Symmetry: C5
């Protein structure tokens, strides 16, 4: 029923919404996130990052950690209405910390500018914009509404000005997965305000199927560089898994077309069908190369696509070697196997689908 | 059992509970006062200056220094009641405690976290609640008006913030409300009223009604971890160290409140073990693990057992906490080889001397 | 025939341009250079040097690392038209990083000035000027054309003002290899613009064949110091190998004359003809003394001169002990034997010749 | 000599009669003076390498300089041929004592930017005694204006206070720090024919109330005038230092308490050969607290003329510290306390604080 | 002549270099260490870069001595081999440039003595700088530093004229005979270049240092003099005496010839059946090379200055073999240098032509 190192069944994770209750291990993760003074990640809105120092999070990855926690908390709010207020509180803290210079300051240290939202920098500010929207869908609070409208207009105006569809992270550095976050943030703003910023999405989905995708492999190239026209000629599994998951919330048929191809290209089923692991690129047998996140993002994609078999296989690969334990009702891993480990396992366990988040029942 | 001395214990529970009646501290309490006061530069109460070598040597985290100073101060106030011959020394140490508490090393996390340059103007009640209680206890012990103008100013900030808030009490930064931090601030208003004949303590009844209605699970006798008034969230876990601290301070203001919940608190959290000889405290529900979270459930429950007059539980807890830390006396000064938690020597000192918060509130004026 | 411990045969490297495809290990090197967020050397145009921190590159060597990667990327553009846009993008990043104060700021820290291009400093600004030109040959982009024109004129004007042929790196410190880069940059500017800045080259080639070369040994002296007149009395293999490789792009006959003499002076064939290693100076049997780059620059010169036998012998010496491996389609060395290791083995495996780069067809 | 003793007690006590320091005292002066840059008395500049090498804590440097200075003043009385050297070293001691490395804890702790304006009597009492001893040894008026200014600050602060003496900070009064300040007034009066010392009788009357246990011959650790507190532990090092300096001003005072002090704190052991000093009551442990009870008792035994206890204490202190003489300079491999070489030097030479007050004028 | 165990070349070979007009191969390998490798060789650049000294762990306060002793050796290379004179001049230009950098003189300001290291006092620094200016111009004929040389020579002349004792202090109350020896020799060199008579002050100084500063029977100087107190530190010093007698031999040969045999009896220990020698730093000890640890190395320079081939051989047999020299790629390294300034002082003693020969160097 449960192999060593698994805490709950795949059936149990997929049934949380129908039961209106998170699993006990998800509650223990929420306790890790919230319980201990000063050192839990969601203790305070202040510019303190002790939880991330303790996990040895690299500075450039903090912005991804906060965002992926926020996306998981939005699904907790949909699963269990009794945890919606807590999830809203944690989302307020997530937005507050995301705005701290420890999180965005690499933009200035690299020489690109003193203001991280004014131009470009869509990985940072796409996540921030999606977070502002999810906070307001969950709580009904207008605390960040003026900032949200301002950043949504920046994103709209940059897309409208560019001859390619979307926005760069820096001059000649375009990433499809960073764009996927920014476009989903426009769908959320439209849900809140009755606007049509999402009308830009069709041009983007047409553009990314042109030279940014390998159609036979169902896989995006690593990056695009508009000034040279270059596409870096390696396909990327973690890039593809993230992008197809977010796109499925905006154009389900797009992701349904490429998902089986993606699986054939990258996913290695092993141990008699019990486990799976994901190769990061073509022309290798090695799993989880590059940034080391192909299997963890494919676990999120399997959840988004409703693929219980692949979800179970990947969590059987990822969770047992990391040695979970529950101490004083809080979850810890002795041997996290990647960056963003507890963040991505939490998000995949609770994820209700990006379309379900867009359609979240309005706040009491 | 209260007159037995287990291995790793320095004085009996009977001896600690008899100190006020005998008008003398135990020898190990005196040896703790020697640790606190004796060696130049490195003892914690050597000087009023902004020097923290004693805390560097113990590896105290910056955010915990304010609690270390405050818990030492609360124990020093009880030393003043136990032995009139030590009351002047306790007053001198309280002056140093207040002076160090005002140093930016102690409060400066407020500014580093981005909340402001002034740690008392608004919010921040754990820091400024302890500072306000310290100002009051210093003046009750000494009769000195050295800090009276600052005490009046901070008492009025606290009074005005309570009056302005729609919930009863003050936050620790927007949407972060802690019952234990508020308990300190309310007790500080009782002390100001004792010194000045005022009625700032009239706010207390609305606060006790609010925390009993909304923030306690009355059947378990246990408070929830925290309240977040903007979102309305209550973090849905009960906390033993939060509850032990809050019930101990509340017992000084409304004894009946803490007497109602104390037996239920013990059933919820306290594990008696070793054939009744020892006890250890679980931090939350749904676990068998002792002293999770911040690791202070047993140490705060030792203070609560002293406040409630529960000699049996005090003995059990001290039998769990003290022997593994390996106390000894060297050159008439107390040392521990293996302190078991943050705030270890501070909380064991406080629990060994504690006269009760009601007795501190009523401290008779000093001899001329 | 694949020699032990090698990734590809010498025949395979020399056939890349005819096959219009890089070898799989060259592609794996391009993956190392480009793939991983933040830590790959060609991730961003920003002033971030994590890739160089992870390799323990000394500050003073970063400028050479960037330039030698750039020179290899220009040959990738000629080998495979389908990788020309990638090579162009990487060259844009290389120019951007080369202008960062982390790269040039030793000039100011040493006390020489706040502006690294206005005078002297030809190793830095010679490489930057060659990189501006190669970027524009590969891409057709005029992004850096005004900066290129400005720096080409500074180089022209300094050559015209000096009584010796060329430019110093600081007062009394003249290096033939740094001048070779600067002169090659004038040939590239002339290819792009139809100018005649290269007309200064003949006076320079005449000058360096006086007190700066031992013509019998085919070897340059370490350095010249025009204020004292001093020539440092040691011959240098890495100085000679670099200089003869770049000179072969401007005056092939010069390098054809000295190359066999250079090999007799410095090159030790060993292991029954299978391997070779290069002595850095005369009067020693030790290989790869000094900066430790004689064998690696001789690998580049063997490629420039079309010498497949010596190329094979040197790569059999250099590559196996460094323990290459390919993980997730990206190349790593466990034990690089020198500074600039992956840069110089990359450049020598792809190098099409400096004259072929000069004559690169438009995009 | 028993292992780790360098000279007999008879030899130390006979130095003034022989007009010569012992060879180990000369080897200590060589440690103090010989090696460029790293000897403590090499230069008058604000360099503290000797103290960095001994790991002296910042707050202890002011005591180290002062105790060296007090030993140098006795060297000047022992051997007229070393009086000029002792004066030169005293000039450097005063110069270094004024450096912010030495006094700057006053500002870092938040008490003020001026270390002499008010309070801070441990620092400025030692500085004022040093100014006086420098002028007694040399006849130089180099520091006379500064000496007059600081003497007047001390006189005016004593006159303003309702308790007898001066605090180190508000509510922190130390009898041993006051003993230094009062002795500095006796030295100023010897030099100038003034009567600043008239304050001494009120101070000796005051410290024999709540600050001393007369039956034990022991001072309490500290007094806190704002609260009235006297810390309730007696202190051996505090008592030994205070009785030694007081014996120079009121010999009868120290003679009254010295036998009681010895009964309270001194343990003779090893068949009468050794002695060691407990720091407080209610312990069998020697040298607790700051770890200086035995070393200050060695100074007190010298001041009181107690050759037996001096020998017993030096037999305890010196051998385990493993002295040796290398190139005519004294080193200790295992100093047992802070201020170790300073206090053993001072006790070996000390002529008595009254003898320093009566020092004949220079030749 | 037989090569003693562990030596690179015979004493006969070092003493024959000037007559043969060629340096020995190990001296050439030392010049290669000094000049060959980019960035890390000490004489690579005129810039304020000290990597060579960082690699040897040279203390900051000793850098000024390292540069000066290299410079004095280079001046003798110029006399030994006309073909190396231009190289020696180039290296001397770099030596002067580096000597002027704040890393070299800045202890003067850090210790609190002033912002200008030449205006007054500080004769060890500025005496060496002044001698280096002169030797640079004798070797090259270059007037690059002539204005600075004239300025510093006048400062030294004016300070000697103002003082009631003969010479200049390092700091107030600290007078060192060896530091003064350098400053006086610098006046002889300025006079050789300019036909002036700044050297006229030398006789008063030689008279002065033969009073309380010398033990005439032992042929040994006291460690230091302190004019404000009148103190003379009561220990005689071998390294002080060896350096002073070497430089004085270039100005008053008879002075050093008088005291040299006495100095040897006082301090020099011959051992190993006459094969080796080592030098005691002070009286009243059997220990060799106490204090700063340079008595044997400075006595090797003095043996060379005085033409004493037997003592030179004995001292080099003591100093060089245990330091484990080797030649790698034609460049000299020591595995175990025995003291500060080790490769500098062995280089200088191996080439030294005599301070009188340097003073009278024939033109380029």
């Amino acid at each position: 029923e449960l192999p060593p190192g698994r805490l709950a069944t795949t059936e149990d994770y997929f049934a949380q919404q129908a039961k209106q209750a998170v699993t006990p291990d998800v509650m223990a993760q929420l306790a890790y996130m919230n319980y201990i003074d000063f050192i839990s990640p969601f203790y305070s809105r202040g510019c303190s990052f002790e939880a991330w120092e303790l996990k040895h999070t690299p500075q450039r990855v903090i912005k991804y950690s906060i965002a992926f926690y926020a996306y998981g908390l939005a699904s907790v709010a949909l699963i269990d209405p009794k945890l919606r207020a807590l999830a809203g509180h944690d989302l307020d803290i997530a937005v507050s910390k995301m705005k701290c210079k420890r999180v965005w300051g690499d933009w200035e240290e690299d020489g690109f500018g003193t203001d991280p939202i004014e131009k470009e920098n869509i990985m940072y500010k796409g996540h921030l914009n999606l977070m502002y929207g999810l906070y307001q869908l969950v709580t009904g609070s207008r605390r960040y509404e003026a900032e949200h409208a301002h950043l949504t207009r920046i994103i709209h105006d940059e897309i409208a000005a560019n001859p390619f569809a979307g926005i760069v992270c820096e001059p000649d550095n375009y990433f499809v997965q960073a764009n996927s976050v920014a476009y989903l943030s426009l769908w959320v703003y439209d849900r809140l305000h009755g606007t049509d910023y999402r009308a830009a999405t069709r041009a983007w989905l047409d553009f990314i199927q042109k030279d940014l995708i390998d159609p036979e492999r169902g896989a995006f190239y690593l990056s695009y560089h508009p000034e040279s026209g270059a596409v870096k000629p390696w396909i990327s599994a973690y890039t593809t898994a993230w992008t197809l998951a977010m796109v499925h919330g905006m154009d389900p048929a797009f992701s349904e077309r490429y998902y089986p191809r993606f699986k054939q290209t990258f996913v290695e089923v092993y141990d008699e069908g019990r486990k799976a692991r994901v190769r990061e690129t073509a022309g290798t047998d090695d799993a989880d190369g590059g940034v080391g996140l192909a299997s963890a993002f494919t676990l999120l994609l399997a959840r988004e696509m409703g693929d219980q078999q692949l979800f179970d296989q990947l969590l059987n690969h990822l969770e047992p070697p990391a040695k979970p334990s529950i101490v004083s009702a809080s979850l810890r891993y002795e041997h996290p196997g990647s960056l963003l480990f507890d963040e991505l396992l939490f998000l995949a366990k609770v994820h209700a689908g990006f379309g379900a988040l867009l359609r979240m029942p309005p706040p009491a």
